[PDB]
Amino acid sequence: KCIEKGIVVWLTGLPGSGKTTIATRLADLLQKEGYRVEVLDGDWARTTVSEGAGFTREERLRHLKRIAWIARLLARNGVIVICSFVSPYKQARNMVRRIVEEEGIPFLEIYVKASLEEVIRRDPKGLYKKALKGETDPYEPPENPQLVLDTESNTIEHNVSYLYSLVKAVIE
Amino acid sequence: KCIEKGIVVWLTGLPGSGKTTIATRLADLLQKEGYRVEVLDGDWARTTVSEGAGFTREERLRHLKRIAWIARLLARNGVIVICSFVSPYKQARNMVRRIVEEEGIPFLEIYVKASLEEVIRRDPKGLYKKALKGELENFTGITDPYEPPENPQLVLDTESNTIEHNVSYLYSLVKAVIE
């Protein structure tokens, strides 16, 4: 398919909330339909555009602005860009939104909601190793997310379906 | 317009050689013909994707590798990516080429040729302003001897030919490659 303008889908939520799997399944659906799609996540970024440590808030902010700009270039060239980043800070996410919206590109902020208690209770191993590896910063939910995907009340498939519906309502 | 895969046109040369003027004029030509085009240059990068980097040789590399990836992503989605950056080192440019070619994307290294004395002579006012405000270490013409490409896909002699002749010459190579 050859659409003039794409969109930016921003998945924000706690690590372990299952953001990437949702992003991944969404991408498969859209690609199968002929859409140009790019999934951008921290794993990818760490080795490519954001390689070079930095966990200071100044650094993460520079990292997020960079992602925002990359999503803006791709979407303005017809790509559906799906971003999966914890992006815990509201102000940071709002800065990302403005960069994308300045281009006239739709910015769909998706809150992938999971409970902090449940995420740590199911992964004591990971918490422990993050403690050993050098891991105070509370997650700030969106004030106006275009969608909230409750990963605990619904199945991954129904959540993917909810997101796919919104995407199509926007791009079709 | 719609093409399956784009290309990466990498302009390399000394600051002041005319790289960016060439990039923009070429970009204007292709867009007017309906192609999806993005011009990536240092001034843009400096306030966006590479906004807070120093200028150490390792810092510049991180930056160039980053540009190579952004270019690769755009190009694999049908975009003609025209790049104009300060990349005096062959190794650095070879690393950029590798990243692009890996995706199977054509990488055209264009040498915008102008001597060091020539770019200095061209812009006295500019030399003085960077020096007076201490924003040198950027004018790599001296701080980092430029290493010409061993085998560029094209050479644009900015001393012998006009910008019109050169933009037109680059445009023919680009059109020959994108079909």
Curated annotation (Swiss-Prot), chain A:
<dbReference type="InterPro" id="IPR050512">
    <property type="entry name" value="Sulf_AdTrans/APS_kinase"/>
</dbReference>
<keyword id="KW-0597">Phosphoprotein</keyword>
<dbReference type="GO" id="GO:0010134">
    <property type="term" value="P:sulfate assimilation via adenylyl sulfate reduction"/>
</dbReference>
<dbReference type="InterPro" id="IPR027417">
    <property type="entry name" value="P-loop_NTPase"/>
</dbReference>
<dbReference type="GO" id="GO:0004781">
    <property type="term" value="F:sulfate adenylyltransferase (ATP) activity"/>
</dbReference>
<feature type="active site" description="Phosphoserine intermediate">
    <location>
        <position position="87"/>
    </location>
</feature>
<keyword id="KW-0808">Transferase</keyword>
<dbReference type="GO" id="GO:0070814">
    <property type="term" value="P:hydrogen sulfide biosynthetic process"/>
</dbReference>
<dbReference type="Pfam" id="PF01583">
    <property type="entry name" value="APS_kinase"/>
</dbReference>
<feature type="binding site">
    <location>
        <begin position="13"/>
        <end position="20"/>
    </location>
    <ligand>
        <name>ATP</name>
    </ligand>
</feature>
<keyword id="KW-0547">Nucleotide-binding</keyword>
<keyword id="KW-0067">ATP-binding</keyword>
<dbReference type="GO" id="GO:0005524">
    <property type="term" value="F:ATP binding"/>
</dbReference>
<comment type="pathway">
    <text>Sulfur metabolism; hydrogen sulfide biosynthesis; sulfite from sulfate: step 2/3.</text>
</comment>
<comment type="similarity">
    <text>Belongs to the APS kinase family.</text>
</comment>
<dbReference type="GO" id="GO:0004020">
    <property type="term" value="F:adenylylsulfate kinase activity"/>
</dbReference>
<dbReference type="GO" id="GO:0005737">
    <property type="term" value="C:cytoplasm"/>
</dbReference>
<comment type="function">
    <text>Catalyzes the synthesis of activated sulfate.</text>
</comment>
<dbReference type="InterPro" id="IPR002891">
    <property type="entry name" value="APS_kinase"/>
</dbReference>
<keyword id="KW-0418">Kinase</keyword>
<dbReference type="GO" id="GO:0019379">
    <property type="term" value="P:sulfate assimilation, phosphoadenylyl sulfate reduction by phosphoadenylyl-sulfate reductase (thioredoxin)"/>
</dbReference>
<protein>
    <recommendedName>
        <fullName>Probable adenylyl-sulfate kinase</fullName>
        <ecNumber>2.7.1.25</ecNumber>
    </recommendedName>
</protein>
